[PDB]
Structure 1
Amino acid sequence: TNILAGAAVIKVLEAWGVDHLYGIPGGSINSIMDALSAERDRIHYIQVRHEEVGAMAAAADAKLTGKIGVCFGSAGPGGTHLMNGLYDAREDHVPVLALIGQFGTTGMNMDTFQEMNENPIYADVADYNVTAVNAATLPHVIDEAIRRAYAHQGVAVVQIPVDLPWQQIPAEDWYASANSYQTPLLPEPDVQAVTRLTQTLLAAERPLIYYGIGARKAGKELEQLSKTLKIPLMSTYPAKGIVADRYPAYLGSANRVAQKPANEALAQADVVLFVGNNYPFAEVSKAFKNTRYFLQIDIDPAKLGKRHKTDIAVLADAQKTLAAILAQVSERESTPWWQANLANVKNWRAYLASLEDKQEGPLQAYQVLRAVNKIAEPDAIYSIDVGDINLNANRHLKLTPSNRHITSNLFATMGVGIPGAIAAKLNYPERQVFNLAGDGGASMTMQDLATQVQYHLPVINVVFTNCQYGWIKDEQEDTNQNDFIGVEFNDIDFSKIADGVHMQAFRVNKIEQLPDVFEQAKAIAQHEPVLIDAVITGDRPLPAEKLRLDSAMSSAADIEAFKQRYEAQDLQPLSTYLKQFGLDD
């Protein structure tokens, strides 16, 4: 006949299939805590050590599964701790529900302890942002929040005065709209636009297909189009893995978290098919300045012609359209453009292998990532933090459609390593999970290594200890007139941190130590989390956006300096392979 409004709120979450949620309790949220406590069997509460880890893990939930992630923070500081995760969810356009504690309605606007107007705090990050003021409608407001987060692919925030969830409401009034939820049936891709787009791509002398995660369902089609038409593939960094890295005509990604062949080919291309792609460096890097025809496939009207003057922009699903293209084309013989690219990729990969294959001496990030590769199961999930690791993992990880990898793509918040791995292991307890993090990022969220221990989540944590914000140091080397500042700092021994949180750990600093430590980590991680602290050199990884290899473009002095610094003696510029197969620049 009556139900507590809090109990009904948890039933709304359960109706929508929310399996787990994150936060830290407080007085301002103890009535939501009270409802969660009665429902331990149906919904799994994860107590984190800092509320940003809960928000980040909620975002990672949605990134991995497509289902709304859920977090909460108490009034004031609990809620404002959420911000780095909430902005990550906004920028990465994934559905997240955030519940914020608030003092009871009798105490609001009284200027009492930790009481403030919380609504303005969340106005910018949130697609939906409301303070609940009635217990009876509270389940509806939560339901509304979830449904809007899904529809708009962003953050819904509800501030909840603590009195409301302890109030009785009629047991029969409230409902969830989970049962109405569905995905649309779209028409077939516009037939005549697709045909026209196909002709333009096929008429190109130096075509590229450049996809992002919008093409995540189209791995098979992308690779078959490439093979059939002899058109090299490049992607955004996040789209690594959609097509297996081993594919010989995968060029990699452009800009900085980038691979040499992709940057080089992009500069030469006359036609780009830009699919499911919102590459944020398009305009600022002038990526398409020499492109003749720009073709686009996107599902979002807001993206149409956004990144470059577009000759044909098809509004449609990536996979459906690429399938439609493939159904109207057939085999083309190998071209000079194709052979030059394949050769360029081969050369690039032998370079990366030479870095990986060093057997002895001072540990670099390159051999550490080889060691990850050697213990990695074919369906492992990588939660990647922010810094050099994005660049190194992009180059070195050997990913297939079976893998997943996540980072903070566009907000680029450091600290995501640990929470992303926690979310990954909670959703996929049977899959191997890595957290690959630099020392600066790992230290931002280090306390939540304890959360992995507490909830028995067998993450393999690999910390890359360079004693630097390496990513930023390299930027300062490029732009700053004065000395390095704030980018070299004191060592933290993360194997001791892990010990302090009661996690098994190792610290290595020599290449020859890798195989036995990674073997042990692999085994330990059948049951318990583990951390390897890899003490690495401060060597700058090859800057793909600053290549000095082409005689027509750079001085011999610049080239020899570059080859020396980046162990790049055997790298050839693309022009070498173009000229080899009869092409100019």
Structure 2
Amino acid sequence: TNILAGAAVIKVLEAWGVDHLYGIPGGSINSIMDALSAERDRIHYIQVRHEEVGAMAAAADAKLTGKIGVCFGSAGPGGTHLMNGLYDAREDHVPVLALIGQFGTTGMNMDTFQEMNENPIYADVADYNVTAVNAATLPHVIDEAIRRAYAHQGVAVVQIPVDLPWQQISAEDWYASANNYQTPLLPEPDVQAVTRLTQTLLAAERPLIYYGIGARKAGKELEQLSKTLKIPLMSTYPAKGIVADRYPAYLGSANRVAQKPANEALAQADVVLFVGNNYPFAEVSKAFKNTRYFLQIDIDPAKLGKRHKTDIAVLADAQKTLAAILAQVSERESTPWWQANLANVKNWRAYLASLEDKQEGPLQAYQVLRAVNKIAEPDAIYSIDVGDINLNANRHLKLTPSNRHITSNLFATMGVGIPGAIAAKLNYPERQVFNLAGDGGASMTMQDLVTQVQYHLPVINVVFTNCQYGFIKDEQEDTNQNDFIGVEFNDIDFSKIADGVHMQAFRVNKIEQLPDVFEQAKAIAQHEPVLIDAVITGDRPLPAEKLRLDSAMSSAADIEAFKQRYEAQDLQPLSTYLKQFGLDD
């Protein structure tokens, strides 16, 4: 006969399969808390120490599983703390439901304590943004918000006056539509469009296949197409790992969180097949200014012809379309272009291994990442923060289709390393999970290291302490006329921070200390979280976008200073390999 409205709201979340959700209580959301408390055997509440970590972990849930993440904040400051995690979910287009506390309906608009019109605050980030005003329709409003966040891959926000979840409604006033749920229909490739695209692709002299995370279910077809037709592969940085990094013709990503072979090859390419890719640097970096033909495959009609004048655009699923190209082609023999790029990838990987393999001396970021590779399991998950770690992880981690890695891709909010790792261990308790974060990014969310201890989530946290905002210092070096400001700062000993939250931790500053510390860490993390604070040098990572290696384009003085600064004496420009195989630059 009757149920409390708050109890029916928790049953709609259970019907939709939500296992865990994040937040911090307050008087303005204590009736939802009361409903959660009764349901604690069926749905699991994760209490965080700052609400932005709860919204960031909810977005990381949806990034990892495809299932909607759920978080909440109390009225006023609880909900405004959620913003960096909600803009991350909007920009990385993943479904998140956020519930916002509000004063009871009898006190709304009376200007009472911590009571304000909360609806204008969430209007820009959310796909659906409503204040609930009736208890009997509140299960439907929650159901409606989840359906929309899934269908539209964005954020749904509901402000709930605290009195409505304590009202009784009838058990027939409500249902969940979770059993009717379906994912959007995938469009099929037009065969004539595929034939025309294939003919342009085969006629190319210097082809590249450039794919994003829209080609996630097509790693087999990508690799197979590359080796049948002898066409090198390059990706956006989030798409690393779709094709194994060891694959000999994988060039890496372009621009700054980039690898040298991809930047050099893109400038020479005559035809690019751009697949499931919304690379945000296309126009501002003039990435395709020398491309003769640009071919596109994407599921979304708003992306077709968006990033560059597009000669043939196919509106279709990436995997279905690459299976259709592959059904029309045959093995081609090796070309000068194929061989020139293979030799260039070999030269680059030998430069990265030489940085990784130093055995003694002052610790640099390169050897830390080599030690992570040594203890990493084949299906490890990586939550990466924002700064030089995106550049260094992209060059040094060796990923396969069995791994997962997540960061804040487009909004690029620092602080995501710790919440992403909490969400990862909750969803995959049996996989090894790492959190790789710079010292500026780990100190923004450092208080939630205690959430890994409190909920027994064994994460290997690795902090790269350079006592700098290193990614911004290198920008100021490049653009600013006056001296550095706001980029070098005081030390924080993170092994002491970890001790304060009662987590095991180590601090290291020499290359020869790494093997034993990472061995111990790997063993601790079978049961408990652990933190390694690696005190690294201030050395700038080689800028793949400002290469000074080619004598035809840089002075001998610039080239020698570049090689000395980046320990790059053995790198050769792509033009060397192009000339060995008879091609021009």
* TM-score bracket for this pair, using the shorter chain length: over 0.9
Which digits, 9 at most, give the CA deviation of each residue in 1:412-437, with x for residues without a partner? 00000000000000000000000000
2:341·2:574 contact (CA, 8 Å) conserved in 1?
yes
Residues 331 and 148 of structure 1: CA distance in aligned 2, closer, same or farther (over 3 Å)? same
SS in 2 for 1:72: strand
For residues 362 and 214 of structure 1, what CA distance do their matches in structure 2 show?
41
Which digits, 9 at most, give the CA deviation of each residue in 1:433-456, with x for residues without a partner? 000000000000000000000000
Is 2:467 the partner of 1:477? no
Match of 2:505 in 1: 505
Question: Alpha-carbon deviation of 1:553?
Answer: 1.4
For residues 503 and 483 of structure 1, what CA distance do their matches in structure 2 show?
39
* Root-mean-square deviation (Å): 0.6
Is 2:175 the partner of 1:175? yes
Is 2:102 the partner of 1:114? no
Residues 93 and 85 of structure 1: CA distance in aligned 2, closer, same or farther (over 3 Å)? same
For residues 41 and 257 of structure 1, what CA distance do their matches in structure 2 show?
44
SS in 2 for 1:418: helix
For residues 328 and 438 of structure 1, what CA distance do their matches in structure 2 show?
47
Which digits, 9 at most, give the CA deviation of each residue in 1:37-82, with x for residues without a partner? 1111111100000000000000000000000000000000000000
Which digits, 9 at most, give the CA deviation of each residue in 1:476-495, with x for residues without a partner? 00000111000000000000
SS in 2 for 1:220: helix
For residues 417 and 184 of structure 2, what CA distance do their matches in structure 1 show?
33
SS in 2 for 1:139: helix
For residues 282 and 227 of structure 2, what CA distance do their matches in structure 1 show?
26
SS in 2 for 1:75: coil
For residues 494 and 122 of structure 2, what CA distance do their matches in structure 1 show?
34
Which digits, 9 at most, give the CA deviation of each residue in 1:98-123, with x for residues without a partner? 00000000011011100000000000
2:151·2:184 contact (CA, 8 Å) conserved in 1?
no
Question: Alpha-carbon deviation of 1:190?
Answer: 1.0
Question: Alpha-carbon deviation of 1:188?
Answer: 3.0
For residues 483 and 115 of structure 1, what CA distance do their matches in structure 2 show?
46
**Of 437-446 and 178-187, the range deviating more from structure 2:** 178-187
Which digits, 9 at most, give the CA deviation of each residue in 1:109-147, with x for residues without a partner? 011100000000000000010000010000000000000
For residues 293 and 307 of structure 1, what CA distance do their matches in structure 2 show?
13
Residues 185 and 118 of structure 1: CA distance in aligned 2, closer, same or farther (over 3 Å)? closer
For residues 169 and 528 of structure 2, what CA distance do their matches in structure 1 show?
44
For residues 242 and 108 of structure 1, what CA distance do their matches in structure 2 show?
51
SS in 2 for 1:253: coil
For residues 42 and 174 of structure 1, what CA distance do their matches in structure 2 show?
19
2:187·2:315 contact (CA, 8 Å) conserved in 1?
no
Structure 1 residues not aligned, in runs of 5+:
none
For residues 555 and 292 of structure 1, what CA distance do their matches in structure 2 show?
30
Question: Alpha-carbon deviation of 1:185?
Answer: 4.5
Which digits, 9 at most, give the CA deviation of each residue in 1:512-542, with x for residues without a partner? 0000000001000001000000000000000
For residues 505 and 462 of structure 2, what CA distance do their matches in structure 1 show?
10
Q: Normalising by structure 1, report the TM-score.
A: 1.00
For residues 544 and 253 of structure 2, what CA distance do their matches in structure 1 show?
10
2:187·2:317 contact (CA, 8 Å) conserved in 1?
no
SS in 2 for 1:553: coil
Which digits, 9 at most, give the CA deviation of each residue in 1:305-346, with x for residues without a partner? 110000011000001101111111110101000000000000
Which digits, 9 at most, give the CA deviation of each residue in 1:345-367, with x for residues without a partner? 00000000000000000000000
For residues 285 and 176 of structure 1, what CA distance do their matches in structure 2 show?
47
Q: Normalising by structure 2, report the TM-score.
A: 1.00
Question: Alpha-carbon deviation of 1:183?
Answer: 2.3
For residues 380 and 511 of structure 2, what CA distance do their matches in structure 1 show?
23
Residues 184 and 412 of structure 1: CA distance in aligned 2, closer, same or farther (over 3 Å)? closer
2:119·2:131 contact (CA, 8 Å) conserved in 1?
yes
Structure 2 residues not aligned, in runs of 5+:
none
Match of 2:467 in 1: 467
Match of 2:153 in 1: 153
Match of 2:228 in 1: 228
2:382·2:433 contact (CA, 8 Å) conserved in 1?
yes
For residues 241 and 98 of structure 2, what CA distance do their matches in structure 1 show?
30
Which digits, 9 at most, give the CA deviation of each residue in 1:446-468, with x for residues without a partner? 00000000000000000000000
For residues 187 and 280 of structure 1, what CA distance do their matches in structure 2 show?
24
Match of 2:570 in 1: 570
For residues 168 and 25 of structure 1, what CA distance do their matches in structure 2 show?
22
2:458·2:530 contact (CA, 8 Å) conserved in 1?
yes
Moved over 6 A (4+): none
2:51·2:78 contact (CA, 8 Å) conserved in 1?
yes
For residues 538 and 580 of structure 2, what CA distance do their matches in structure 1 show?
36
Question: Alpha-carbon deviation of 1:224?
Answer: 0.4
SS in 2 for 1:445: helix
Match of 1:436 in 2: 436
2:363·2:537 contact (CA, 8 Å) conserved in 1?
yes
Residues 187 and 468 of structure 1: CA distance in aligned 2, closer, same or farther (over 3 Å)? closer
Match of 1:353 in 2: 353
Question: Alpha-carbon deviation of 1:186?
Answer: 3.4
Aligned length, in residue pairs: 585
Q: Percent identity?
A: 99
For residues 27 and 307 of structure 1, what CA distance do their matches in structure 2 show?
48
Is 2:427 the partner of 1:449? no
